[PDB]
Design a protein around this ligand. Structure first.
Ligand SMILES: CCCCCCCCCCCCCCCCCC(=O)OC[C@H](COP(=O)([O-])OCC(O)COP(=O)([O-])OC[C@@H](COC(=O)CCCCCCCCCCCCCCCCC)OC(=O)CCCCCCCCCCCCCCCCC)OC(=O)CCCCCCCCCCCCCCCCC
Ligand SMILES: CCCCCCCCCCCCCCCCCC(=O)OC[C@H](COP(=O)([O-])OCC(O)COP(=O)([O-])OC[C@@H](COC(=O)CCCCCCCCCCCCCCCCC)OC(=O)CCCCCCCCCCCCCCCCC)OC(=O)CCCCCCCCCCCCCCCCC
Ligand SMILES: CCCCCCCCCCCCCCCC(=O)OC[C@H]1O[C@H](O[C@@H]2[C@H](O)[C@@H](O)[C@H](O)[C@@H](O[C@H]3O[C@H](CO)[C@@H](O)[C@H](O)[C@@H]3O)[C@@H]2OP(=O)(O)OC[C@@H](COC(=O)CCCCCCCC[C@H](C)CCCCCCCC)OC(=O)CCCCCCCCCCCCCCC)[C@@H](O)[C@@H](O)[C@@H]1O
Ligand SMILES: CC(C)=CCC/C(C)=C/CC/C(C)=C/CC/C(C)=C/CC/C(C)=C/CC/C(C)=C/CC/C(C)=C/CC/C(C)=C\CC/C(C)=C/CC1=C(C)C(=O)c2ccccc2C1=O
Ligand SMILES: CC(C)=CCC/C(C)=C/CC/C(C)=C/CC/C(C)=C/CC/C(C)=C\CC/C(C)=C/CC/C(C)=C/CC/C(C)=C/CC/C(C)=C/CC1=C(C)C(=O)c2ccccc2C1=O
Ligand SMILES: CCCCCCCCCCCCCCCCCC(=O)OC[C@H](COP(=O)(O)OCCN)OC(=O)CCCCCCCCCCCCCCCCC
Ligand code: HEC
Ligand code: HEM
Ligand code: HEM
Ligand SMILES: CCCCCCCCCCCCCC(=O)O[C@H](COC(=O)CCCCCCCCCCC)COP(=O)(O)O
Ligand code: FES
Lengths: 42, 73, 58, 223, 184, 51, 102, 139, 533
C-alpha cells in the first residue's frame, strides 16, 4: 500500500523507513506514530 | 493500420478487412450447422456443433456491435 | 522473487498437470472414479484398469 | 470331481453373482447369462484378467488376473456344469495345452490370419480401433491357449469362430502365426511399433528433420 | 556478506527431496514387517562382494566432488573440470555396477512382479539410481557451461550447489546400503 | 434373440435364409473391404475411412 | 565482388590451441576412415542370409542390416563433421559483397 | 538471519519428539508393533527441518548482521546491485510441455512416448541452464 | 611435379575452351550464409540419394502383375500366390546382400525429400521470397512438390503388397471412377479395364522410374538455374541493401560447406536406413482384394488427402438417375488446394497491391497477416494429417473413434480460426518486443537498489545516450535485435587451453587479443561499407 496502483515493473520507486509491521500506515499517518507506541499495550 | 497498433505496418501486409473475418465467421458457423445433416444416429455431436456455432455467432455479433457503437476500432 | 524462471515453470507445470488429469473425461472409460483419496486396492489395475486413473496419477 | 465343482461355486458366489446372478442366468443391464458359454469362455475371461469386470463402459480391458490356475479350472468347471459348452484344450498330463497348440504350417496360418483377423488386429497383431470406444488389443501377450479360447468363444466384439468354421488344425496354424509374428525380431532395425507409415512419418520429422535442421544451424549463421 | 541465494534454494529443495525417499523407505519397512521371518526370502541371495566395492566408489566420488568445490572456490576452472570429470566417471561406474547387480538378481528369480521384496528393493534402489543418473546429467550440463564463458562467482556457485546434490545422493545410498544389505 | 430387431429393405425381404445374412464385403464408399464385424453391436466397420 | 574482410584463423603461430584443433579435425576424419573400413569388413564377412524363426542364427541375421547403416552412416557423417570443422577453424573467415545488377 | 533457523530448530525439536513418542507408543499396546509408515515419515520429517536448520545455523554464524536483520537499519544501507534476475524466458513453458509429454507416455504406458519425453526434458532443461551463458556466434 | 601437372592441365583446358572469365565468375559468386538458406539443399541432396538408390533397385525389380508361387527363403510366405512385383521385392530384401539396406535408405530418402520440401516451402512463404522477380520460381517449386507427392505415392505401390494395394484400390480407383461424366473413362484408360487389371504396376513402374523423375530433374535444373542467375534474397542487416548480396564466395567456403552438408545429410539417411525398420513388406503379405488390415494409412505426405476423405461428411447428389459420390468433394478440394498454392504470389500482389522489385526478405513477425495465414494453413494441414491417423491415435491414446472423426470435423473449421487469431496477435506482439529494446536497450537482468529504495534494472544501450544517461531511441531496420547480454559478449571466454589443462598465459593473451582484434575489424569493415553506400 506504499506503492502505486498498479506497482511498477520492479514494484518500488522508493521505500520508507521500516520500524514496525505497519510501515505504510506510519508513512501515510506520521502523527499516529506516537499514539500506536503508547497505546499498544492494554 | 496505424503504426501505433502494428509497429511494423510499413514493412509488410498488416491489415485484413474486418468484413472478411465477420463473413468468414458467419460462414464458419453455417458450415457447422449444415454438418448435422448426415448418417450419424447420435445427437451428442449435434449439440457440440450447435454450441460451437452459437459461440462463433456470439463472438461475431459482439465484435460487430462493439465496432458499430465505436467502443473498439 | 528469488527464482523468476522457476516461478514461471511452476505455473506451466501446474497448468499442464491439471489438464492431463482432467483429460480422462475424453476417454471412453472416463476419468478417475475411486475418489480423490484413491484408497487401495481399489486403485489397483485389477479394480481400476482404465486409463483415466493413470492420467489422474500422472 | 465334486471338489472342483464346489470350489468353483464357492469362488463364484463372492465374485460373480452381482453381475451374472446366483444361478448364472445373468443380471439385466449388468451382465449376460453364463449358461452354455462353456469352460473355454471362463478360462479366457479369467486368465486374461478380463473378469471379474469392474464397471460398464465401451469395452472391458484386460488386467492382472484375480485367480490362479487352480481357481480358474474350478470356476470353469462350475460354469461348464451349467449348460455345457466348449472346453479349453488340455495335454496328456491334464494341464492346459500351450506347446501342443502350435501348428506346423505358419504359411497357412498367415493367410488365414490376414483373411480373418488382420482386419481387427492389424497385419502383425498390433491392435486396431473399433467403432465407439472399442478396440482390438495387441496380441503379443496372449499365450496359445488364450488365442485358441478367444477364437473359440468370441469375446465381446470378436466373432465366435466355431470348430466347424475354423477346424482345430486351422486354429493351431493361426496361433502359430500369432505366436511367431510376435516373437520375430525386426530385420531392418527398430520396429517403430509395426503400425506402418504413421510412426514412420513421426520418426522422420522428429529425428531426421531435427538433425538436418540442427546441422543446418551449425553450418549456417543467424540474423 | 549475504547468503548464497542459489545455495539456499538448493538446500531447501534437497530437504524436500528426502521426503520422497521417506515414502520409499516406508514401503520397504512395511513389507519387511510382513515378511514372516524371511527377509530377503528365497531365492533372493544378496552378495556383498559387488555391492561393497560399488558403494565405496560412490563414497570416494564425494571426496573428489569436494575437491572440485575447493578448486571452484579457488577460481581454478581447470581444477574443477578435472575433479568433476573424475567424479562423473565413478558415478557412471556406480550406475553400471548397480545394473550389473540387477542383471544377476533378475536371472536368479528376483524381479519386481516376482516377489514383494523385489518390488521394494527395486523401487528403493532404482529410484536412487535415477537420482544418480540425474546427478550425472547435472555434471555434464555444468561442465558444458564451463566452456561457454569466463569463470564467474555465480558460475562457482553453480558448481557448489551441484556438489550439494551429489553429497545428498551419496548420503542417501549409505542409508539404503546399510538398511538393505545389513539390517535384513 | 436379436431377430426381432432386423429391418428389411424393400425388394430384399427374402434375401436371408432365416438368421443367415449375406452382405457384400466391398464398402460402398471407395471399395475397401469393410470386414470389421462387431457381433454385439451388429456394426460393420470399414478400416479405410471409418464407415 | 569486393571482399571487405579476410583474415587468417591463426594469426599467432606456434600455439598449442592450433595443434589441438588440428588433431580434432583429424580425429573425425580418422573415425570416418575407420567406419568406412568397418563397412567394407561387415559387408563381406557378417552373416547376411535370412534365418528362420527360432533358429540359432536369427539374432545375428537381425543385426546384418543395422550394421550396414551404422558403419556406412557413421563413416560419411564423420567425414562431413571433419569438413565442417576445417572450414570453421582453418579456412579464413571472409565477408564478400557482390553487386546484383538485377 | 538468526530468526530463520530458530524457526526450523523449533520445528525440528517438535518433530523429533513426535517421532520418538509415536515410535515408542506404537511399540507398546499397539497391534502389530511399531507402525513403520508413520514412524519413517515422522523421523525423516525431522530430517527435513534438521538439514535446513543446520545449514541456516552455519550460514548465520559466518556473516554479520544484514540490513534486513537490523532492528534499526536505514533504507540507504541496502544500496547496491542485488544480483541477476532473468528478465524473460520461454524455456519454462517448454520444460513443462516436455515433462507433460513424458507423463502422458507413462500414464498410457507408451515407451516411445516416454523416451521422447525424457529427451525433450533434457533438451528443454539444457536450454534453461545455458540461456544466459551462450556466447556470440562465431561464423 | 603436382604443381606442374595442374598448370599444364589448366593451360590445356584454357587453350581448347578458354573458360577463364566464366569460371572465375562462378568462383566469385556470393551466397548468403543464413542457416535457413540450406533448407533447399536438403531436398536436393535427398533427390540425389533417391536417384542413386533407385538405379540400384531397378537392377533387381520385376514389375509384373502375373501371379506366381513364392519359392524364396522367407518361410512364412512359402507357396503363397503372389505377383512378380511382390516376388522380387522380397528377393531384394532377402536374396540380395544389402538389398534391405538399400530399399530402406530409398524409402527414408523419399520421406526426407517430402519433408524437406514442406520445410523449405515454409521459409519461402513466410520470408516473402516468392515476391517478384521470383514469382515463376515459386510456381516451378509448387509443381515440384505436387510431382514429389505422386512420385512417392507410386513408389510404394510398386511392391503390390496388401497395405499399398489397399491404398491403390481406394485412392487411385474409387475416387477416379467416382468423378462425374468422364470419371469411369479415366479409370479404364489408366487401369486398362477394371481394378486391378494386369498393366497397372508396369505402367506405374515406368512413370516412377523414368517419366516423373525425368520431369522433376528438368524442373529442378530450371529451379537451380533460376536461383543461380536471378541471385539469392538475403535478410536485412548491416551492409545489406536491395542491390547487393552479402555473404561468402563459392570458392572455397561455400563449396566446402555445401559438400560437407551433403556428407552429413547422407549419413543421417544412411543411419536411419540401417537403424529403423521402414515398410516391412513381408509382414503385410501380397495384395488380395478379399483382405484388409487396420491402420491403412498412406505415407505422411499423402495423409492430408486421406484425412480429407475421412473427415468430409457423406454428402452425395443423385440428379436424373446419376450419382455424385463423396469422393468428388475430395477430388475438387484437392485441386483447389493446389490451385491456391500455385497462384498465391499473384493473389497477394492483387490484394496488397505491392508489385515492386524485392531482394530483401521480410521477417515473419513483420508481416502478421501472411504469417497468420500460413500458420492457419499449417494448422489445417496438421489436423488433416492427424485425422488420417485417427484410428491409430484412438487405439494408443484411448480416444473414441467416433470422437476423433468429430473432433477433426469440428476442428477443421474451428482450429484454423483460433490459430489465425493467435498467430496474428503473436506476430504483432514480437514487434512490440523488438521495439522495447530499441527505446530502452537490452535488459541485463541486474537489479540495483537506489539509496532512496528505488529498484531499477540496468540496461545496455545499443546506440548513443543522452546527457541524463537514457539511450537515444533507435529506428527499426528489419533486422533481429539482441535481447541477451551473453549474446553481446558480456560473458567473455573461459580461458585458452584443453578441457583439462590450461595453455601458457602468454598464448592465451595473444589468442584473445587476436580474436578481439579480428572481431573489431570485421565489424568496422561492415560499418564502413554501410556508411559508404
Ligand atoms: C528436479 C528439480 C531440481 C531443481 C531444484 C533446485 C532449485 C534451485 C533453484 C535454482 O537455482 O534454480 C535454477 C534454475 C531456476 O531458474 P532461474 O529462476 O533463472 O534461476 C537463476 C538462479 O538464480 C541462478 O542459478 P544458475 O543459473 O547458476 O543455475 C543453478 C543450477 C545450475 O545447475 C546446473 O549446473 C545444472 C543443473 C540442471 C538440472 C538438471 C536436470 C536433470 C534432469 C534429468 C532427467 C533425466 C533423469 O543449479 C541448480 O538448480 C541446483 C540443482 C542441482 C541439480 C539437481 C537436479 C537433479 C535431478 C534429479 C532427477 C530425478 O533452474 C534450473 O536451472 C534447474 C531447474 C529445472 C527443473 C527441471 C524440471 C523437470 C524435472 C523432471 C525430471 C524427470 C525426468 C523424467
Ligand atoms: C527419442 C527421440 C529423440 C528426438 C531428438 C533427437 C534428434 C537427434 C538430432 C540431434 C541434433 C543434432 C544437431 C547438433 C549439431 C551439432 C552442433 C555442435 O557441434 O555444437 C555447436 C552448436 C553451436 O554452434 P554455433 O552455431 O556456432 O552457435 C550459435 C549460437 O551460439 C547458438 O546459440 P543460441 O542462443 O541460438 O541457442 C543455443 C541452442 C543451440 O541448440 C540448437 O540449436 C540445437 C537444437 C536442435 C533443434 C533443431 C530444430 C528445432 C525445431 C524445434 O541451444 C539451446 O538453446 C538448446 C540446445 C540444448 C542442447 C541439446 C542437448 C542434447 C541432448 C539430447 C538428448 O551447439 C549446439 O547446437 C549443440 C547441440 C547439442 C546436440 C547434441 C547432439 C545429439 C546427438 C544424439 C543423436 C541421436
Ligand atoms: C545424427 C542423427 C542420426 C541418428 C538417428 C538414429 C536414431 C535411432 C536409434 C535407435 C536404433 C536401435 C537399433 C537396434 C534395432 C533392434 O535391434 O531392435 C530391437 C527390438 O526392439 C523392439 O522389441 C521390444 C522387445 O524387445 C520385445 O520383446 C517386445 O515384443 C516388443 O514389443 C512390440 O511387440 C510386442 C509383440 O511382440 C507388442 O506387444 C508391443 O506392443 C510392441 O509392439 C518391444 O518393442 P517396443 O515396445 O516397440 O519398444 C521397446 C524399446 C523402447 O522404445 C524406444 O525404443 C523409444 C526410443 C526410440 C524410438 C523412435 C523415436 C520416437 C519418436 C516419436 C515422434 C515420439 C513422440 C513425441 C511427440 C511430439 C510431437 C507430436 C505433435 O525398448 C528398447 O529397445 C530399449 C533401447 C534404448 C536405446 C536408446 C539409444 C541410445 C542413443 C544414444 C546416442 C549417443 C550419441 C553421443 C555422441 C557424442 C522391437 O522394435 C523389435 O522389433 C526389435 O527387434
Ligand atoms: C549398399 C550401399 C552402400 C549403397 C548406397 C548408395 C548410396 C546412397 C551412395 C551415396 C554416396 C555418396 C552420396 C557419396 C558422396 C558424398 C560426398 C558429398 C562427398 C564427401 C565430400 C567431403 C567429405 C568433403 C571434403 C572435401 C571436399 C571434397 C569438399 C567438397 C567438394 C565439392 C566440389 C563439393 C560437392 C558437393 C556438391 C555436389 C555441390 C557443390 C558445388 C555447387 C556449386 C553446388 C550446386 C548448388 C548448390 C549446392 C546450392 O546450394 C545452390 C543454391 C542456390 C542456387 C543454386 C545452387 C547450386 O547449383
Ligand atoms: C481427428 C484427430 C485429429 C484426432 C485427435 C484428437 C485428440 C484428442 C488427440 C490427442 C488426444 C490425446 C493426446 C490424448 C491423451 C490424453 C491427454 C493427456 C490429453 C491432452 C491434455 C492436454 C491438452 C494437456 C497437457 C499438455 C499437452 C499438450 C500434452 C500432450 C502431449 C502429447 C503426449 C501429445 C501426443 C498426441 C499425438 C496426437 C501424438 C501421436 C503422434 C503419432 C503420429 C504417433 C504414432 C506412433 C505410434 C502410434 C507408435 O506406436 C510408435 C511406436 C514407436 C515409435 C514411434 C511411434 C509413433 O510415433
Ligand atoms: C521404467 C520401468 C523399468 C522396467 C521395469 C521392468 O519391467 O522390470 C520388471 C522385469 C521383471 O520381468 P519378469 O516378468 O519377472 O520376467 C523377467 C524374466 N527375465 O525385470 C525386472 O525385474 C528388472 C527391474 C529393474 C529395476 C528398475 C528400477 C526402475 C525404477 C523406477 C520404476
Ligand atoms: C474384430 C471384429 C475382430 C476380429 C475379426 C478378430 N478379433 Fe480378436 N479380438 C477382438 C477384440 C475386440 C478383442 C478383445 C475382446 C475382449 O473380450 O476384451 C479380441 C481379443 C483377441 C485375443 C485376446 C488378446 C489378449 O488380450 O491377449 C486374441 C488372442 C485374439 N483376439 C485373436 C484373434 C484371432 C486369432 C482372430 C482371427 C481368427 C481374431 N482375433 C479376430 C476383435 C477381433
Ligand atoms: C524439389 C524440391 C525443391 C528443391 C530441391 C529446391 C531447391 C532450392 C534450392 C537449393 C534453393 C536455394 C537455397 C534456398 O534458398 O533454400 C531454392 C530456392 C528457392 N526455392 Fe526451392 N526447391 C524446391 C522446392 C521449392 C518449393 C516447393 C518452392 C515454393 C513453393 C520453392 C521456391 C523456391 C524459391 C522461391 C527460391 C528462391 C530462393 C530464395 O530467394 O531464397 N522451391 N530452392
Ligand atoms: C522423387 C524421387 C523418388 C521418390 C520420392 C521415390 C519414392 C519411392 C518409394 C517410397 C518407394 C518404395 C520404397 C520401398 O519399397 O520400400 C520407391 C520404390 C522404388 N523406387 Fe523410387 N522414388 C524416387 C525415385 C526413383 C528413381 C529415380 C528410381 C529409379 C531410377 C526409383 C526406383 C524405385 C524402384 C525400383 C522401386 C521399387 C523397388 C522396391 O520396392 O524396393 N525411384 N520409390
Ligand atoms: C577430372 C579432372 C578434370 C580436369 C580438372 C582440372 C583440375 C586442375 C585445375 C588446374 C588449374 C590450374 C590453375 C593454375 O594456376 O594454372 C594456370 C593455368 O592457366 C590457367 O589460367 C587455366 C585457366 C582455366 C582453369 C579452369 C579450371 C577449372 C577447374 C575448377 C576446379 C574447381 C597457370 O597460370 P599461372 O602461370 O600460374 O598464372
Ligand atoms: S473405403 Fe470403406 S469407408 Fe471409404
Amino acid at each position: 500500500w506504499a506503492t502505486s496502483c498498479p506497482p511498477p515493473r520492479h514494484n518500488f520507486t522508493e521505500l520508507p523507513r521500516i520500524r514496525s509491521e505497519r510501515p505504510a500506515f506510519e508513512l501515510h499517518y506520521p502523527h499516529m506514530v506516537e499514539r500506536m507506541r503508547a497505546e499498544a499495550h492494554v | 493500420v496505424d503504426v501505433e497498433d502494428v509497429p511494423s505496418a510499413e514493412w509488410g501486409w498488416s491489415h485484413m478487412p474486418i468484413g472478411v473475418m465477420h463473413i468468414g465467421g458467419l460462414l464458419s458457423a453455417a458450415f457447422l450447422l449444415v454438418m448435422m445433416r448426415g448418417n450419424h444416429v447420435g445427437h451428442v455431436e449435434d449439440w457440440f456443433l450447435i454450441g460451437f456455432a452459437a459461440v462463433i455467432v456470439a463472438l461475431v455479433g459482439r465484435n460487430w456491435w462493439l465496432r458499430r457503437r465505436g467502443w473498439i476500432r | 522473487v528469488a527464482f523468476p524462471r522457476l516461478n514461471a515453470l511452476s505455473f506451466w507445470l501446474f497448468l499442464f498437470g491439471a489438464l492431463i488429469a482432467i483429460a480422462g473425461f475424453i476417454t471412453p472409460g472416463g476419468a478417475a472414479d475411486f475418489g480423490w483419496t484413491a484408497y487401495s486396492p481399489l486403485t489397483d489395475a485389477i479394480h481400476s484398469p482404465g486409463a483415466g486413473g493413470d492420467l489422474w496419477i500422472m | 470331481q465334486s471338489a472342483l465343482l464346489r470350489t468353483g461355486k464357492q469362488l463364484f458366489e463372492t465374485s460373480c453373482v452381482s453381475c451374472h446372478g446366483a444361478n448364472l442366468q445373468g443380471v439385466p443391464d449388468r451382465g449376460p447369462s453364463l449358461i452354455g458359454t462353456g469352460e473355454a469362455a471362463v478360462y479366457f475371461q479369467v486368465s486374461t484378467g478380463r473378469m471379474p469386470a469392474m464397471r460398464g463402459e465401451a469395452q472391458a480391458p484386460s488386467k492382472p488376473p484375480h485367480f490362479d490356475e487352480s481357481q480358474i479350472d474350478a470356476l470353469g468347471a462350475y460354469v461348464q456344469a451349467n449348460g455345457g459348452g466348449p472346453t479349453v484344450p488340455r495335454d496328456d498330463h491334464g494341464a492346459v495345452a500351450q506347446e501342443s497348440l502350435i501348428g506346423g504350417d505358419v504359411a497357412r496360418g498367415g493367410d488365414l490370419f490376414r483373411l480373418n483377423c488382420a482386419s481387427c488386429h492389424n497385419f502383425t497383431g498390433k491392435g486396431g480401433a473399433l467403432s465407439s470406444g472399442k478396440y482390438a488389443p495387441d496380441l503379443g501377450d496372449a499365450n496359445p491357449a488364450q488365442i485358441y479360447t478367444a477364437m473359440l468363444t468370441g469375446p465381446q466384439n470378436m466373432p465366435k469362430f466355431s470348430d466347424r468354421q475354423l477346424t482345430p488344425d486351422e486354429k493351431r496354424d493361426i496361433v502359430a502365426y500369432v505366436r511367431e509374428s510376435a516373437e520375430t525380431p525386426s530385420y531392418g532395425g527398430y520396429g517403430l511399433g509395426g503400425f506402418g507409415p504413421a510412426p514412420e512419418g513421426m520418426a522422420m520429422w522428429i529425428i531426421g528433420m531435427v538433425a538436418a535442421i540442427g546441422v543446418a544451424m551449425w553450418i549456417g549463421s543467424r540474423a | 556478506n549475504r547468503p548464497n541465494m542459489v545455495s539456499v534454494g538448493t538446500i531447501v529443495w534437497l530437504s524436500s527431496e528426502l521426503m520422497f525417499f521417506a515414502g520409499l523407505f516406508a514401503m520397504y519397512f512395511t513389507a519387511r514387517a510382513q515378511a514372516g521371518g524371511a527377509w530377503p526370502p528365497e531365492p533372493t541371495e544378496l552378495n556383498l562382494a559387488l555391492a561393497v566395492p560399488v558403494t565405496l566408489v560412490l563414497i570416494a566420488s564425494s571426496f573428489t566432488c569436494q575437491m572440485g568445490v575447493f578448486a571452484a572456490e579457488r577460481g581454478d576452472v581447470f581444477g574443477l573440470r578435472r575433479w568433476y570429470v573424475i567424479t562423473f566417471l565413478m558415478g557412471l561406474f556406480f550406475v553400471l555396477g548397480q545394473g550389473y547387480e540387477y542383471i544377476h538378481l533378475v536371472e536368479h528369480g528376483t524381479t519386481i512382479p516376482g516377489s514383494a521384496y523385489g518390488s521394494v528393493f527395486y523401487l528403493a534402489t532404482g529410484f536412487h539410481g535415477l537420482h544418480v543418473i540425474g546427478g550425472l546429467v547435472a555434471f555434464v550440463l555444468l561442465l558444458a557451461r564451463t566452456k561457454m564463458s569466463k569463470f564467474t562467482p555465480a558460475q562457482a556457485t553453480a558448481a557448489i550447489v551441484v556438489s550439494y546434490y551429489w553429497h545428498f545422493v551419496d548420503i542417501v545410498w549409505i542409508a539404503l546400503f546399510a538398511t538393505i544389505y545389513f539390517v535384513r | 434373440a436379436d431377430m426381432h430387431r432386423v429391418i428389411k429393405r424393400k425388394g430384399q425381404e427374402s434375401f436371408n435364409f432365416g438368421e443367415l445374412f449375406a452382405y457384400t464385403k466391398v464398402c460402398s464408399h471407395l471399395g475397401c473391404p469393410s470386414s470389421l464385424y462387431e457381433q454385439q453391436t451388429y456394426r460393420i466397420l470399414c478400416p479405410c475411412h471409418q464407415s | 565482388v569486393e571482399t571487405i574482410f579476410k583474415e587468417p584463423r591463426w594469426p599467432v603461430p606456434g600455439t598449442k590451441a592450433e595443434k589441438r584443433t588440428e588433431r580434432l579435425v583429424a580425429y573425425w576424419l580418422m573415425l570416418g576412415g575407420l567406419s568406412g573400413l568397418a563397412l567394407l569388413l561387415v559387408f563381406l564377412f557378417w552373416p547376411w542370409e535370412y534365418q528362420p524363426f527360432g533358429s540359432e542364427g536369427e539374432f545375428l541375421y537381425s543385426l546384418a542390416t543395422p550394421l550396414y547403416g551404422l558403419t556406412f552412416g557413421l563413416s560419411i557423417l564423420s567425414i562431413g563433421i571433419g569438413a565442417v570443422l576445417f572450414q570453421k577453424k582453418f579456412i579464413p573467415e571472409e565477408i564478400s559483397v557482390q553487386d546484383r545488377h538485377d | 538471519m538468526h530468526i530463520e533457523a530458530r524457526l526450523f530448530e523449533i520445528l525440528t525439536a517438535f518433530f523429533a519428539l513426535a517421532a520418538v513418542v509415536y515410535a515408542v507408543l506404537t511399540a507398546m499396546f499397539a497391534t502389530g508393533g511399531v507402525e513403520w509408515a508413520g514412524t519413517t515419515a515422522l523421523v525423516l520429517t525431522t530430517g527435513l527441518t534438521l538439514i535446513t536448520g543446520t545449514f541456516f545455523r552455519f550460514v548465520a554464524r559466518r556473516l554479520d548482521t544484514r540490513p534486513e536483520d537490523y532492528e534499526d537499519a536505514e533504507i540507504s544501507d541496502g544500496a547496491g546491485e542485488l544480483g541477476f534476475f532473468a528478465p524473460h524466458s520461454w524455456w519454462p513453458i517448454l520444460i513443462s510441455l516436455s515433462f507433460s509429454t513424458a507423463a502422458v507416455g507413462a500414464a498410457l504406458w507408451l515407451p516411445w512416448l516416454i523416451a521422447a519425453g525424457v529427451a525433450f526434458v533434457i533438451t528443454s532443461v539444457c536450454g534453461l541452464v545455458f540461456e544466459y551463458y551462450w556466447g556470440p556466434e562465431k561464423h | 611435379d603436382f604443381a606442374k601437372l595442374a598448370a599444364a592441365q589448366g593451360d590445356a583446358i584454357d587453350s581448347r575452351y578458354h573458360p577463364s572469365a566464366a569460371v572465375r565468375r562462378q568462383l566469385n559468386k556470393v551466397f548468403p550464409t543464413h542457416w535457413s538458406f540450406l533448407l533447399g539443399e536438403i531436398a536436393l541432396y535427398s533427390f540425389i540419394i533417391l536417384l542413386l538408390t533407385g538405379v540400384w533397385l531397378t537392377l533387381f525389380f520385376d514389375p509384373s502383375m502375373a501371379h506366381v508361387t513364392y519359392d524364396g527363403v522367407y518361410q512364412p510366405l512359402r507357396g503363397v500366390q503372389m505377383s512378380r512385383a511382390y516376388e522380387t521385392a522380397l528377393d531384394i530384401s532377402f536374396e540380395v546382400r544389402g538389398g534391405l539396406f538399400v530399399r530402406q535408405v530409398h524409402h527414408w530418402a523419399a520421406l526426407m525429400f517430402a519433408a524437406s520440401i514442406m520445410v523449405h516451402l515454409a521459409r519461402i512463404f513466410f520470408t516473402g521470397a516468392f515476391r517478384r522477380p521470383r514469382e515463376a520460381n515459386w510456381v516451378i517449386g509448387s509443381l515440384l512438390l505436387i510431382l514429389a507427392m505422386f512420385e512417392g505415392f507410386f513408389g510404394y505401390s510398386l511392391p503390390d503388397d496388401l497395405l499399398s494395394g489397399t491404398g491403390i484400390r481406394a485412392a487411385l480407383s474409387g475416387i477416379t471412377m467416382g468423378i462425374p461424366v468422364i470419371g469411369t473413362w479415366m479409370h479404364w484408360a489408366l487401369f486398362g479395364g477394371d481394378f486391378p487389371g494386369e498393366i497397372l504396376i508396369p505402367r506405374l513402374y515406368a512413370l516412377h522410374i523414368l517419366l516423373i523423375p525425368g520431369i522433376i530433374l528438368a524442373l529442378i535444373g530450371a529451379h537451380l538455374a533460376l536461383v543461380w542467375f536471378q541471385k539469392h534474397t538475403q535478410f536485412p542487416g548491416p551492409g545489406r541493401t536491395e542491390t547487393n548480396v552479402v555473404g561468402v564466395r563459392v570458392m572455397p567456403v561455400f563449396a566446402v560447406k555445401s559438400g560437407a552438408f551433403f556428407a552429413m545429410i547422407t549419413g543421417v539417411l544412411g543411419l536411419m536406413g540401417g537403424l529403423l525398420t521402414i515398410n516391412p513388406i513381408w509382414n503385410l503379405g501380397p495384395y488380395k482384394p478379399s483382405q484388409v488390415s487396420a491402420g491403412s494409412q498412406p505415407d505422411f505426405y499423402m495423409m492430408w488427402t486421406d484425412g480429407l476423405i475421412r473427415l468430409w461428411p457423406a454428402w452425395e447428389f443423385y440428379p436424373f438417375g446419376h450419382t455424385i459420390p463423396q469422393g468428388v468433394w475430395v477430388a475438387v478440394g484437392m485441386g483447389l488446394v493446389f490451385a491456391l498454392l500455385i497462384a498465391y504470389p499473384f493473389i497477394e500482389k492483387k490484394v496488397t497491391g505491392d508489385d515492386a522489385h524485392h531482394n530483401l526478405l521480410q521477417r515473419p513477425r513483420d508481416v502478421p497477416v501472411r504469417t497468420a495465414i500460413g500458420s492457419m494453413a499449417i494448422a489445417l494441414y496438421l489436423l488433416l494429417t492427424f485425422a488420417c491417423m485417427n484410428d491409430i491415435i484412438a487405439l494408443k491414446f484411448h480416444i473414441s473413434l467416433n470422437a476423433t472423426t468429430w473432433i477433426g470435423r469440428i476442428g477443421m473449421v474451428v482450429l484454423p480460426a483460433i490459430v489465425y487469431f493467435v498467430a496474428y496477435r503473436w506476430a504483432i506482439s514480437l514487434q512490440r518486443s523488438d521495439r522495447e529494446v530499441l527505446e530502452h536497450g537490452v535488459e541485463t537482468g541486474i537489479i540495483k537498489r537506489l539509496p532512496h529504495g528505488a529498484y531499477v534494472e540496468l540496461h545496455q544501450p545499443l546506440g548513443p545516450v543522452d546527457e541524463h544517461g537514457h539511450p537515444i531511441p533507435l529506428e527499426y531496420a528489419g533486422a533481429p535485435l539482441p535481447k541477451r547480454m551473453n549474446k553481446l559478449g558480456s560473458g567473455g571466454a573461459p580461458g585458452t587451453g584443453s578441457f583439462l589443462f590450461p595453455d601458457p598465459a602468454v598464448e592465451h593473451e595473444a589468442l584473445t587479443e587476436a580474436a578481439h582484434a579480428s572481431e573489431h575489424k570485421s565489424l568496422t569493415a561492415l560499418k564502413e561499407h554501410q556508411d559508404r553506400i
